[PDB]
Amino acid sequence: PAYHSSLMDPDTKLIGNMALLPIRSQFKGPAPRETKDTDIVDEAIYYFKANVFFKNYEIKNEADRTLIYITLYISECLKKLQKCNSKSQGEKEMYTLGITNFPIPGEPGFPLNAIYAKPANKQEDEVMRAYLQQLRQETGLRLCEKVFDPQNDKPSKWWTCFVKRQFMNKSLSG
Amino acid sequence: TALVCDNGSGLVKAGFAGDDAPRAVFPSIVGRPKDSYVGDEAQSKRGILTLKYPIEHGIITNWDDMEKIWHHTFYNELRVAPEEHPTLLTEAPLNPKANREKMTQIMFETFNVPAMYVAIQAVLSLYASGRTTGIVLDSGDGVTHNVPIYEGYALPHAIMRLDLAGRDLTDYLMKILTERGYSFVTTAEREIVRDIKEKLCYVALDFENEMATAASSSSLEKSYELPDGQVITIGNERFRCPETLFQPSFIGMESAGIHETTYNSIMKCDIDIRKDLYANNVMSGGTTMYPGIADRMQKEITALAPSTMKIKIIAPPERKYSVWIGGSILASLSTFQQMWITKQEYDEAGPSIVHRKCF
Amino acid sequence: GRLPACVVDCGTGYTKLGYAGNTEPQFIIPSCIAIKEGVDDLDFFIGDEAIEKPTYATKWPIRHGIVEDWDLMERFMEQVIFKYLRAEPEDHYFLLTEPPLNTPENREYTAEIMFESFNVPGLYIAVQAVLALAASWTSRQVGERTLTGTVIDSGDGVTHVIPVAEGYVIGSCIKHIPIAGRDITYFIQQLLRDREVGIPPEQSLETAKAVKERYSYVCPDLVKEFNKYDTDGSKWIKQYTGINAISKKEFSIDVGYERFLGPEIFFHPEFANPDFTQPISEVVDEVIQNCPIDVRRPLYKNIVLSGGSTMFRDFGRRLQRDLKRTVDARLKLSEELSGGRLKPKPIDVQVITHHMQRYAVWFGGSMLASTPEFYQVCHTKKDY
Amino acid sequence: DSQGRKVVVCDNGTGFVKCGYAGSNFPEHIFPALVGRPIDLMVGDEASELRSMLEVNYPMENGIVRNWDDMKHLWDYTFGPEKLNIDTRNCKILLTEPPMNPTKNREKIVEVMFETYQFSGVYVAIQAVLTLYAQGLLTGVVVDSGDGVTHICPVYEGFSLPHLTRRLDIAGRDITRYLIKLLLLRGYAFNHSADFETVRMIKEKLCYVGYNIEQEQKLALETTVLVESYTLPDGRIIKVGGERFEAPEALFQPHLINVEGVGVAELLFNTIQAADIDTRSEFYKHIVLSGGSTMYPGLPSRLERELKQLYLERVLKGDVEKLSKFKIRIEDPPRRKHMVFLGGAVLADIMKDKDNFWMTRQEYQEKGVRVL
Ligand SMILES: Nc1ncnc2c1ncn2[C@@H]1O[C@H](COP(=O)(O)OP(=O)(O)OP(=O)(O)O)[C@@H](O)[C@H]1O
Ligand SMILES: Nc1ncnc2c1ncn2[C@@H]1O[C@H](COP(=O)(O)OP(=O)(O)OP(=O)(O)O)[C@@H](O)[C@H]1O
Ligand SMILES: Nc1ncnc2c1ncn2[C@@H]1O[C@H](COP(=O)(O)OP(=O)(O)O)[C@@H](O)[C@H]1O
């Protein structure tokens, strides 16, 4: 019923219980880089429009913890990027949106923390904070093409109607 | 074209004289909530009908429902008028004498058949085998009998009766099946547990050796398709059900098996006819279909008879309907025309045939 | 049969009236009564003359499939008989319809209202399942006519799943899905009041109902349809033009993603009801597999659909595919449990759709009441 | 203990398990025999208040062990640190054995009890003997009912008579199932699985066997003093009327729920009129009722009438003078439910000291079987 994870390589890594996959990045970020184009970002956004209505969701896979994070951040990104007009100004707003110290799992203030692994180690915190920030920044470039329309340069009304929904009835911004 | 209408506790049979197979074989069961639901239609609407059996243990207990069964036999199954031609009927041995004519008077009072030759069930199975002298087992659904017949005569002082029959075996099979884990409950699920009995049961010589082989090596296992999509693997009851006939102590009855009573049948007889009666023991009935049941009898009797003579035990293939064919080969015969219980006797003597023509 | 019988079917959202022996009902009206709040008792209107009326309080006397007020149902039946049907009740037989799981009290009060007030010679109250299953034979092969099946009774209130075996209804194995058409239009209203501006508040329900009835269908998978909508918008996006209630100003809206998320809440009730999460593909399976063991196969082979909310395109296909998928795995598990020596016969699952699906109960009532022997079944006046 | 004052007796049933010590006239603890798993293991009383959110399983059926992986978990709960608190190494046990039990099951419980628990004394007792040991008699007839099947079994001095034992396949489970079907025809829908224990309280509280059916129907048709209101946990109020005296009458008329037979009253007659002539009077005077499914009001007072009428038109046809000399008596004390336990509370008290009643641990260390 619900759309579970995809692209689980056998030889991966599980810092916390995230799954580090290759991502086509162009801003910054220490990470393994990508040789193909079908990253988990473009795969996750393709699944976005059907998942917002699902209130119950099974934790099938480790890399499913990647889909619970991106899909929960695109909700906030659509919520913020509503009243802007210009594509360039909206792009600047999403670029500055990535520069924010959101609470990673493992500290109070992060909701839905019951299904997460606590990085008690001294080393996991910095890599988790780096990569979740990198992912939240990287989503903006690919969201810019689709949030606005190319013919008239306003937010399309089709995209700006999954704004009041919350995946599993609990959003990041408490 | 005489009608042979063989009654029975399990499945009533009806057909013409010239044929060699019963045309109408349907269950003898009557349902009540219309009231005239008997047979397959009674079985179909089991959710509303309180089914009940008219015939019990070979003696008619309820008489109205037996009349309903007879009415259904001559109207829907055959589609003929009652009085077109004579009708033959059969009743088990060791019956109340008045009950022979209690059905005659209710037959004439609603059908007025031209004639009757009401006879015993076991006297004609021996003719169907092809001889006039021998021992007969009526191993049926309600009762089992041992009946010797010499020159067409039934000796009333040399018969024996056993209560063990098919329904007790089916109940025992249900009880064994509950223990394995595949629970079968209520009377609706009877018709399927009978089905396991038909084609997944047999008899073995060494009852103990067969148990040892079954328990040790799991090669005596068989798969059965229930009509739900499920499959049941069945093991060690393939021989623990039919062995109840040879050892009735499993259910609890202290009576002897069907293998010692064939001895007591012929001990209670003359010296000079035993050489004739060992030579031809004839099986019959619906509850003697199992494979290898000839061999167990052939091994058991040889261990209990004198070793100075030969015991031959035989059985046709068509054992289930041997009562019907034996009727039809007797109803249609040359010199059979003159000795019926005809209608003019009852018309002339009035209600006096019920205590005169009892032969 | 000197005059035909009268058939009246009462529902939560609609009432259907007609005469025996006809294929179509002569009147499908809303079940609304409007009154004013001597002979002031008779000043009222029913049906289409009660949906909007200024100086009259309107209301609905049937809710959830039961009668809430009887003083209103009596008057409703008076103007059903004496205005639209134009039948004298003293020389006609009546074939009414009861909800599933009806109490004896509710069944007897209807007989009171009929016999004591209208002098009806004969009355027959019939269960909906057998009448729905009788109409299924109009579009079936000659070699298969049986009273065995499972009916998915949909509509405007609550959805029932009722199995019937050999003419009678098995009361224990009846289960209720709380989804129906009213929930679908409430859901599509909330969808439409987030994306489009131009809908007056008053005509929201009417526009939602119109969009539900005109353009609505089911899809195999949601992601492919969402991709197809954005990839090629000209083919799959249409326009709806409506007339305002004030000043006749025409307005236009675009029908988009609400086309195929409307009838999806049958198969995913968690989209719109948080207290229920079981898809309809499983309720039918669990109702079928709680019955006597000898009648499991014929019920799967005949799953008929009766009700207005099953009128969507390709509704039966999803039920068929899901039920085949969920029974094949069970047979595979049973086969692997017993090695591989014996392969069970695969269960054939089948769903039957007809031309007569919106008013199947009325059609069954018309066919039953036209037979000569129907007059030997009803309760006569002297019996009461 | 050293002097022998740590003998424990327990009655194991399909619906309820009743455990206690010897020398007491009451059970120490009663609890229902439910083990279930959610949709780790919830065993015992906790599987009663919540069962709609739990999948249940009954690990026994008339003494036959359905699964040999759940009885161990139930017996741990019985002989564990929540009910009895026994030090299992120093104890002796007295168990029940229902009539007509197969050999393999009898020597499997005895086999498993000496191995995985290390008791010091085991005995297994027939329930028919124990029921009369609690009544002071030695020869009699026990008509026991419950949640399995209704057994009628005679017993001569100390030893039962398995040849003359009869059984009838209806009990409390069939009656409480039939009550669901009857209540379904009033607008009240109770599902088979999750509401089994809600209708059981209705059966226990409001049901009774009628003496004369005629006055029951007259009061049911022309009077409203039989209808009673029952409150539910949800807060609804249902009304139960003439269904009170229809559900319990599957016992006397077994064909109402599709069971072929003769009923309890006639089956008792067919059992007493099947023994030798001399001992038939010894059984007429002493008939004892046991089990929880014989506590309906009026069930004592109906069997007497049925037996008197069945014995005045089958044996002594007509001639209504000699029935006064024919004495028939049924014993039924208000302690019917626990008569299996109380008998076990006596037999373990008399024979507490002499070391031949019990099966010693050392017997199975060498022999592995028993002859007592
Ligand atoms: N294509 C369609 N054609 C007709 N009605 C449709 C269609 N799609 C949905 N519907 C809905 O079907 C319902 C028709 O009502 P219907 O006559 O089936 O109910 P009812 O029998 O009165 O109700 P209930 O059985 O709950 O008492 C209306 O809600 C209508 O909106
Ligand atoms: N006062 C009462 N009235 C009616 N039914 C009752 C009453 N008290 C108990 N019951 C029913 O009697 C049954 C109790 O059976 P009991 O405790 O005697 O079991 P048991 O003898 O251990 O069972 P079994 O021999 O089947 O294993 C339950 O159905 C309970 O509902
Ligand atoms: N193929 C079979 N194999 C074994 N037993 C059978 C078979 N067919 C029927 N039976 C048993 O035989 C019974 C029918 O016996 P039947 O010959 O009708 O007795 P009667 O004719 O005296 O009533 C059935 O109840 C069934 O248990």
Ligand SMILES: [Mg+2]
């Ligand atoms: Mg026969």
Ligand SMILES: [Mg+2]
């Ligand atoms: Mg309808």
Ligand SMILES: [Mg+2]
């Ligand atoms: Mg007990």
